[PDB]
């Protein structure tokens, strides 16, 4: 099977400038090599086919480029439309196959995250398990570190995070950690800690709260 | 306008079956040739299958013959993907597409895209908790809340918050699979801690797969 390689995962970008996303194969597909965009929740538009052809509709700042294993996207001044994430197709051979895309996010000023620390609910511990969440809102860049200390201790493996899509209009990322534990550890510890790192920060911040109060 | 209608899918249990449909109008559909994609949780898209405007061409990838059969009705300007044998792997979100065949098997046009899980586990509505508002709340600052959604089974819930009259600064974040095999997510949103104490706050839970639906209250705790 021929491999589509897409060397970033993630570029960042300004409104107006050029961005050009590669594509490569892992053997010639001469030039038969279509690019798609799509959006969160949205399926994919057709944009490149025949690598550096139009579809009909497609704005004339979308162009494509390469032949035999090699192979570009350019985006001419980029509108804020275009926020999305591309990716290339193959048509030489079967099976087809698809490159698994690149996102692009808009810059802007570094924001540090607000920082929120949730206890379970009284409702929760009847059921035997305690969640316990902490929130960092409206930040960026996307790269964050949330640990979480329970009475000062580094855990490890019982947490999991979530993180938001840029939002269109501040363009900052939020994101959610949970911590889970049964309700019988939960009673047996008194600090519950969520620490953060983040570009923003000169140091890290910590929300905590004492069980029970 | 051209547009691909799918339907179908859901949750079905391993070495089950299940018929996926892609109607397609605003095209001559039997002029054309058409294609099943699907991508995965996490995963890139994968090319599952093709067939010509009169059915005497199918091809599969080689991966996938085994389990998939893709058919069209050209009257009911409709194709197929029937799904047998299925496996957990096959957990993923199916698109149809028609192909650009004046020059090659690009997609031109894209369905909505159907979702199917394949599991061993019954549906399972969520329970919802509050994530009440900070006691320390900054004083004439910004308090955040929230409700947690939790142990849901298949995907998706929506949440809202007033009855959708609550928009602003809410963040609902993508659910996660927790090892149990069951979903979480929360909805949080950030509001003026003036606010605490005139007005109320409740998140609207729906989990239609099991017709759960949750109005939770999300207050300062005593």
């Known amino acids: 099977d021929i491999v589509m390689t897409q060397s970033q995962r993630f570029m960042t970008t300004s409104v107006g400038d050029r961005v050009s996303v590669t594509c490569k194969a892992s053997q010639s597909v001469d030039s038969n090599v279509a690019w798609y965009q799509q959006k969160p929740r949205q399926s994919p538009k057709a944009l490149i086919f025949?690598?550096?052809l139009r579809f009909s509709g497609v704005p004339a700042r979308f162009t494509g480029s390469g032949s035999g294993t090699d192979f570009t996207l350019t985006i001419s001044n980029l509108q804020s439309e275009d926020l999305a994430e591309y990716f290339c197709?193959?048509?030489?051979?079967?099976?087809?196959?698809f490159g698994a895309g690149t996102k692009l996010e808009l810059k802007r000023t570094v924001a540090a995250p607000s920082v929120f620390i949730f206890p379970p609910s009284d409702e929760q511990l009847k059921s035997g398990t305690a969640s316990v969440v902490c929130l960092l809102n409206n930040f960026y860049p996307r790269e964050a570190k949330v640990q979480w200390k329970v009475d000062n201790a580094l855990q490890s493996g019982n947490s999991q995070e979530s993180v938001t899509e840029q939002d269109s209009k501040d363009s900052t990322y939020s994101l959610s950690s949970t911590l889970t534990l049964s309700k019988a550890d939960y009673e047996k510890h008194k600090v519950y800690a969520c620490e953060v790192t983040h570009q923003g920060l000169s140091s890290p911040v910590t929300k905590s709260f004492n069980r029970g109060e | 306008q051209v547009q691909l209608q799918q339907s179908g899918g859901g949750l079905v249990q391993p070495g089950g079956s299940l018929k996926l449909s892609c109607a397609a109008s605003g095209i001559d559909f039997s002029r054309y040739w058409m294609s099943w994609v699907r991508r995965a949780p996490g995963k890139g898209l994968e090319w599952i299958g093709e067939i010509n405007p009169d059915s005497s061409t199918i091809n599969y990838a080689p991966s996938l013959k085994d389990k998939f059969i893709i058919s069209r009705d050209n009257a009911k300007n409709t194709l197929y993907l029937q799904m047998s044998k299925v496996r957990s792997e096959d957990t993923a979100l199916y698109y149809c597409?028609?192909?650009?065949?004046?020059?090659?098997?690009?997609?031109?046009?894209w369905g909505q895209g159907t979702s199917v899980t394949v599991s061993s586990a019954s549906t399972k509505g969520p329970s919802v908790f509050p994530l009440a508002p900070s006691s320390k709340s900054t004083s004439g600052g910004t308090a955040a809340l929230g409700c947690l959604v939790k142990d849901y089974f298949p995907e998706p819930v929506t949440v809202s918050w007033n009855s959708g009259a609550l928009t602003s600064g809410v963040h609902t974040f993508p659910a996660v699979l927790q090892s149990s095999g069951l979903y979480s997510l929360s909805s949080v949103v950030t509001v003026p801690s003036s606010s605490l104490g005139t007005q109320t706050y409740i998140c609207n839970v729906n989990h239609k797969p099991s017709n759960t639906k949750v109005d939770k209250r999300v207050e300062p705790k005593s």
């Open positions: 025949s690598a550096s």
């Open positions: 597409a028609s192909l650009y065949y004046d020059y090659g098997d690009a997609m031109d046009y």
């Open positions: 197709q193959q048509y030489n051979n079967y099976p087809l196959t």
